[PDB]
Design a protein around this ligand. Structure first.
Ligand SMILES: CN[C@@H]1[C@H](O[C@H]2[C@H](O[C@H]3[C@H](O)[C@@H](O)[C@H](NC(=N)N)[C@@H](O)[C@@H]3NC(=N)N)O[C@@H](C)[C@]2(O)C=O)O[C@@H](CO)[C@H](O)[C@H]1O
Ligand code: FES
Ligand SMILES: [K+]
Ligand SMILES: [Mg+2]
Ligand SMILES: [Mg+2]
Ligand SMILES: [Mg+2]
Ligand SMILES: [Mg+2]
Ligand SMILES: [Mg+2]
Ligand SMILES: [Mg+2]
Ligand SMILES: [Mg+2]
Ligand SMILES: [Mg+2]
Ligand SMILES: [Mg+2]
Ligand SMILES: [Mg+2]
Ligand SMILES: [Mg+2]
Ligand SMILES: [Mg+2]
Ligand SMILES: [Mg+2]
Ligand SMILES: [Mg+2]
Ligand SMILES: [Mg+2]
Ligand SMILES: [Mg+2]
Lengths: 72, 128, 86, 137, 48, 23, 97, 74, 122
RNA sequence: AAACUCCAGUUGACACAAAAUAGACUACGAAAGUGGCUUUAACAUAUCUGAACACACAAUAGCUAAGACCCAAACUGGGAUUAGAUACCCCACUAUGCUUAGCCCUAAACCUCAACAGUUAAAUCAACAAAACUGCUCGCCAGAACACUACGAGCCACAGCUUAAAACUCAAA
C-alpha cells in the first residue's frame, strides 16, 4: 500500500514504542498509524515533499502529547 | 609503429595539453603504457586512412581493422613464445574470421574490399 | 628453520598441569588440521583419491549441517503432549 | 597479573622466572616420537648435550620400542642423567605423532623434572618431497 | 581534470637535483601502513 | 552396471599383445 | 474502481544488505597488523570464511596479500607476530575452551 | 487433535457422525467386512481439516471419491 | 606504468643507507623511470632469517620507492637489485593505487539449490 | 628377518625437486588441463551450424639426444609368508617422473548425457540415473560373438596408432 513507505520510515527512526498492539481489538489504532493519518492529512494541504511533510507530522503529535523517542 | 612519444588516444583531445611540462607529456605517452595503448592508436590510423566514417566501429570494415591489429599482436607474441599453443590457436582462428569478413565484404561492397586489402596489405585468396 | 623458535605450536603449563596443556595443544592442531594432514602425508595420496575424499567430506558436511539444522528446529516440539486423549 | 598460554617473547621484558632463570635459559627436551622408537635428548640454552635416552638404549627390541611403556622408561633414564647436572625445569619440544609422544612427557616428570611448556615441531611440508606409495595392509 | 591534478604533483616528483635532499628527509620520517579493524568495521589506528 | 563386456575385451587384447611378443 | 487495492511496489520494509567488516576498505600487503588478524597464532594458518566472516572478494584479497607479504619479508609464515597478539579478535574461533 | 473434542460434540449436537481418530484403512473401501453387508455408508463427508498430522491429504478424500461420496472440505 | 619497489636494505648507518638509496634511485632514472616518492617504513626485525650474498641477516630497513617506468625497465632493474650487496630483498609490484576498487552493495544471500532431484517416490 | 652402523639426535649452512592452510571458494581455459610469489605479453568472432582424414592442439605412459637428481619408483636383487608365491608385507636400487630439443597421438580423454535457440503447458514419465519436451543442423548406430582382430592405405610411429570386414558359429546376448 502507499502508507507502507511511511511506516518503514517511522519504525526506522523511532521503532516500535512502549505501547503494545491489541490485535484482538479490530478498531485499534497504533502510534505509527496515527502518524500516517496526520501525514496523509497534511498531504491534502498541498505539501509536495516528503522530508518537510515527515518533519511537520512529528511536531503535531508532540503537540498532542504523543511520545516519540528516537533510537538516539 | 607509432613513436613512443605519441600521446594516448584519450588525452590528445583534451585542450591545453600542447603547452605543459615535458614530464607530464612523457607520462601520458606510449612509453609509460602497455602494449594495448599502442594498438588503440594503430587502429585509429587505419580508420582515418580507410573508412569514410571512423566514428562507426560496428561496421564490417571497422571489425576487419580491429581484428587485423590483434593478428599482428599475436605474431609478435609468437615470435618470442614459439611454444605457446594457446595464442597459436587464437591467431589461426582470427585469420579464419577475417577471411569470412573479406568474403562477405567482397560480396556486398567490392569497392571497400579493394580499399581495405590495399590499406592493410591483405592478399585475398580463394579457398581450395 | 629460519623462523624464531618457541613461538609456534607452543603452550605454557599452568601450575604443573601438563595434561591440560597437551589437550589444549592437541586441540589447536586438530582444529587447524595439522593432525589429519600428517596422517595423510605418511603415504602418498594420488590426486584421484584425494579428490574423491574431498567430495566425500564436502557432501558429508552439507548433509550433517542440514540434519542438525532440522534437529534444532524441531527440538521445540519435544515437549509434552498438550492434547493427551484426543 | 593473569596467566597467558603464549610464551614470553625474549626481547620484551617480563617477570616470569624459574629458579632465577629466564625462559630462554631453560634447558630443552627434544622428543622425537616416531612410530617404532622414541628418542629423547635434553639440551641447554646454548645447545650443549646433557642427556640422551631412547627405547633402544634402555634394552628394548623390535616392536617393544613402539609402546607407551618404553617411552616412559626412556624419560626416566634421561630425567635421571640430567638431574645430576642441575636440571629441574625444561621446555618440551615434541616432534612426531608416535605412541611415545605423551608417555615420554610423563616419564620426564617421574624423574624430578618440571615441564613449563609444550612445543610441537612435527615436520609438515608445504608440498616438498613425495612419500612412499600407499600399502594394501 | 586528471591532467591538472597530475601537473601539480609532478613538481614534488624526485629529480636528480633534489635526489640527495629527499633521501635525507625520508630517513627522518616514517610511514605506517598498519591499522587493525574491529567487529563493527571501525579502523583502529596505531598510537605511535 | 557390470564390466562383463570389458573383461571379454580385456583378455582379447592381452592374448593379442602376448602373441605379437612371441612372433 | 476501488482505491483500497494494493499497488505494485518494491519491498519498502527491506533491510539494507549486510556488509563485511572490510567492505569499502583497501587491503594492502604492507598492513601486517590487519593480515595477522585472520591467521592462527600458533600455526600461522589462514582462517576460512566461516571463521573470519569475510566475503569471497575480500577473503581472497587477504589470502593473496598474506602470501605476498610472507615471501617479500613483511610477514611470518609459521606463526603470528607476537606484537599483534593484543589486537581486537574478529575471528569466530575459541581454542582453550 | 486440538479440535477433536469440539467436532465430536457438535456431531452429537446436530445428530450426525464424526471421525476425528486414526483412520483405519478400509472404513469406506472395505465397510462390508469391517461393519457388515447391510451397512450404509455416509452420503456426505465434511472435511474440516483435509490434511493429516504429517501434512498430507487425508486418505478419506480419495476413499470417498472411489465410493462416489460427495465431500465438503475447508 | 606505476610500480612500487618494496626494498629491504641491510642494517647499516645513515651515511651508507643514503648512499645506497641514491645509487638505487639513479639506476631507475637511467632506465627511464620517473621516481615519485621515497617512503621509509623504518628498521625492524625480519620475520625470518634471510641469507643473501654470503651473509645471514636478522634485521633490515624497509623502504618504498613509488615510480613510473616502461614495461621493459622492470626486468632490467630486477637484475640490478640481485647484484647489490646492500639490498637484502627487493621486489617490484604494480602500485595498488592504480587499481580502482569496485563499489560493493553487500552480501547477497544464496537460497538452497532446488529441483536437484526428481519429485518421485523412491 | 634382512639391511645400515663415517649410523642417530640437537644446532648451523645449503635445490634445475615439489608447491600445507586459504579452498565450507567454485573461477580460468577449446578440451586436455590449471590452486606458491612477482613482472611482461595475453585470452578469436556483432547470426547459428560445420570434418576419424584439412589446419592446430591433446593427461599419464613411452622412444631418441644432452643435462640434473632431494624423494618416490616398473624391472631386478635380497628378506619373509605360503602346499607353491614369478604376488600382496619389509629393504635397496634402476628406467622413468624434472629441464632443453624433437617425436609418439592414446584413456572409463566419462559430467558416458553433441552445437545453437526455446518452453514448463499438454498424454508428466517403461525402469534406473541427473524431470519431461520442441525447433534446427552435423556426426554416428541397426542381434551376439569373431573384432580395440585380418587384409589394404596412410603416418618421424616398425611388438605402434588410425580406419576397419568376412567366413565358420549360436538362438540368444
Ligand atoms: C529357452 N531356451 C534356453 C536356451 O536353450 C538353448 C541352449 O542353446 C545353447 C546352444 O545349444 C549351444 O550350441 C550354444 N553354445 C555355443 N558355444 N554357442 C549355447 O551358447 C546356447 N545357450 C544359450 N545361448 N544360452 O541349449 C539349446 C539346446 C537350447 O535348449 C535350444 O533351444 O538356453 C539355455 C541355457 O544355455 C536355457 O537353459 C534354455 O532355457
Ligand atoms: S561485502 Fe562489500 S566487500 Fe565484502
Ligand atoms: K565418468
Ligand atoms: Mg575372447
Ligand atoms: Mg604451496
Ligand atoms: Mg563452427
Ligand atoms: Mg565424415
Ligand atoms: Mg581418434
Ligand atoms: Mg601427448
Ligand atoms: Mg617423457
Ligand atoms: Mg630412493
Ligand atoms: Mg622375491
Ligand atoms: Mg633415476
Ligand atoms: Mg578427464
Ligand atoms: Mg557438433
Ligand atoms: Mg554385431
Ligand atoms: Mg586401444
Ligand atoms: Mg590393428
Ligand atoms: Mg596393416
Amino acid at each position: 500500500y502507499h502508507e507502507d513507505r511511511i511506516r518503514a520510515k517511522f519504525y526506522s527512526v523511532y521503532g516500535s514504542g512502549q505501547r503494545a498492539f491489541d490485535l484482538f481489538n479490530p478498531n485499534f489504532k497504533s502510534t505509527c498509524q496515527r502518524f500516517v493519518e496526520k501525514y496523509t492529512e497534511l498531504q491534502k494541504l498541498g505539501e509536495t515533499d516528503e522530508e518537510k511533510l515527515f518533519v511537520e507530522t512529528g511536531k503535531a503529535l508532540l503537540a498532542e502529547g504523543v511520545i516519540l523517542r528516537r533510537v538516539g | 609503429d607509432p613513436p613512443p612519444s605519441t600521446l594516448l588516444k584519450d588525452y590528445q583531445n583534451v585542450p591545453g595539453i600542447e603547452k605543459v611540462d615535458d614530464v607530464v607529456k612523457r607520462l601520458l605517452s606510449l612509453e609509460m603504457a602497455n602494449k594495448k595503448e599502442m594498438l588503440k592508436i594503430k587502429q585509429e590510423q587505419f580508420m582515418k586512412k580507410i573508412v569514410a566514417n571512423p566514428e562507426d566501429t560496428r561496421s564490417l570494415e571497422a571489425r576487419i581493422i580491429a581484428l587485423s591489429v590483434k593478428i599482428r599482436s599475436y605474431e609478435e607474441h609468437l615470435e618470442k613464445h614459439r611454444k605457446d599453443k594457446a595464442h597459436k590457436r587464437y591467431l589461426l582462428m582470427s585469420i579464419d574470421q577475417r577471411k569470412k569478413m573479406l568474403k562477405n565484404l567482397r560480396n556486398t561492397n567490392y569497392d571497400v574490399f579493394e580499399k581495405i586489402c590495399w590499406g592493410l596489405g591483405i592478399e585475398y585468396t580463394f579457398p581450395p | 628453520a629460519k623462523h624464531l623458535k618457541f613461538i609456534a605450536r607452543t603452550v605454557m603449563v599452568q601450575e604443573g598441569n601438563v595434561e591440560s596443556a597437551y589437550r589444549t595443544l592437541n586441540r589447536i592442531l586438530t582444529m587447524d588440521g595439522l593432525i589429519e594432514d600428517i596422517k595423510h602425508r605418511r603415504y602418498y595420496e594420488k590426486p584421484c583419491r584425494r579428490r574423491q575424499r574431498e567430495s566425500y567430506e564436502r557432501c558429508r558436511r552439507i548433509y550433517n549441517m542440514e540434519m542438525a539444522r532440522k534437529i534444532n528446529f524441531l527440538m521445540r516440539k519435544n515437549r509434552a503432549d498438550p492434547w493427551q486423549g484426543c | 597479573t593473569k596467566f597467558s598460554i603464549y610464551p614470553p617473547i625474549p626481547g620484551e621484558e617480563s617477570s616470569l622466572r624459574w629458579a632465577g632463570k629466564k625462559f630462554e635459559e631453560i634447558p630443552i627436551a627434544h622428543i622425537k616420537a616416531s612410530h617404532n622408537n622414541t628418542q629423547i635428548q635434553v639440551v641447554s640454552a646454548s645447545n650443549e648435550p646433557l642427556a640422551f635416552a631412547s627405547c633402544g638404549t634402555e634394552g628394548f627390541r623390535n616392536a617393544k620400542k613402539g609402546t607407551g611403556i618404553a617411552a616412559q622408561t626412556a624419560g626416566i633414564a634421561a630425567a635421571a642423567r640430567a638431574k645430576q647436572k642441575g636440571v629441574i625445569h625444561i621446555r618440551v619440544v615434541v616432534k612426531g605423532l608416535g605412541p611415545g609422544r605423551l608417555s615420554a612427557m610423563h616419564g620426564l616428570i617421574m624423574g624430578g623434572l618440571e615441564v613449563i611448556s609444550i612445543t610441537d615441531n612435527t615436520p609438515i611440508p608445504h608440498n616438498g618431497c613425495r612419500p612412499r606409495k600407499a600399502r594394501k595392509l | 581534470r586528471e591532467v591538472l591534478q597530475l601537473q601539480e604533483e609532478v613538481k614534488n616528483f624526485i629529480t636528480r637535483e633534489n635526489l640527495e635532499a629527499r633521501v635525507e628527509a625520508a630517513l627522518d620520517s616514517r610511514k605506517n601502513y598498519n591499522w587493525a579493524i574491529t567487529r563493527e568495521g571501525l579502523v583502529v589506528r596505531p598510537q605511535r | 552396471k557390470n564390466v562383463l563386456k570389458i573383461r571379454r575385451r580385456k583378455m582379447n587384447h592381452h592374448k593379442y599383445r602376448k602373441l605379437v611378443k612371441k612372433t | 474502481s476501488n482505491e483500497d487495492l494494493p499497488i505494485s511496489m518494491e519491498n519498502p520494509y527491506k533491510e539494507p544488505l549486510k556488509k563485511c567488516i572490510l567492505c569499502g576498505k583497501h587491503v594492502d600487503y604492507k598492513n601486517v597488523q590487519l593480515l595477522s588478524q585472520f591467521v592462527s597464532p600458533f600455526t600461522g594458518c589462514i582462517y576460512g570464511r566461516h571463521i573470519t566472516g569475510l566475503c569471497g572478494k575480500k577473503q581472497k584479497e587477504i589470502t593473496k596479500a598474506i602470501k605476498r607479504a610472507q615471501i617479500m619479508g613483511f610477514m611470518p609464515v609459521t606463526y603470528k607476530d607476537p606484537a599483534y597478539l593484543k589486537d581486537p579478535k574478529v575471528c569466530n574461533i575459541r581454542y582453550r575452551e | 487433535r486440538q479440535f477433536s473434542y469440539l467436532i465430536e460434540n457438535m456431531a452429537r449436537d446436530c445428530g450426525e457422525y464424526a471421525h476425528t481418530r486414526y483412520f483405519r484403512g478400509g472404513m469406506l473401501t472395505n465397510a462390508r467386512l469391517l461393519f457388515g453387508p447391510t451397512v450404509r455408508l455416509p452420503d456426505l463427508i465434511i472435511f474440516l481439516h483435509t490434511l493429516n498430522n504429517i501434512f498430507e491429504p487425508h486418505v478419506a478424500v480419495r476413499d470417498a471419491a472411489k465410493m462416489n461420496i460427495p465431500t465438503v472440505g475447508i | 606504468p606505476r610500480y612500487e619497489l618494496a626494498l629491504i636494505l641491510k642494517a647499516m648507518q645513515r651515511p651508507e643507507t643514503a648512499a645506497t638509496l641514491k645509487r638505487t634511485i639513479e639506476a631507475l632514472m637511467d632506465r627511464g623511470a620517473i621516481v615519485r616518492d621515497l617512503e621509509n617504513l623504518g628498521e625492524r626485525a625480519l620475520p625470518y632469517r634471510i641469507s643473501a650474498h654470503s651473509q645471514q641477516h636478522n634485521r633490515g630497513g624497509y623502504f618504498l620507492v613509488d615510480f613510473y617506468a616502461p614495461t621493459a625497465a622492470v626486468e632490467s632493474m630486477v637484475e640490478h637489485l640481485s647484484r647489490d650487496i646492500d639490498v637484502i630483498r627487493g621486489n617490484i609490484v604494480k602500485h595498488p593505487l592504480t587499481q580502482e576498487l569496485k563499489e560493493c552493495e553487500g552480501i547477497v544471500p544464496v537460497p538452497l539449490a532446488e529441483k536437484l532431484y526428481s519429485t518421485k517416490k523412491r
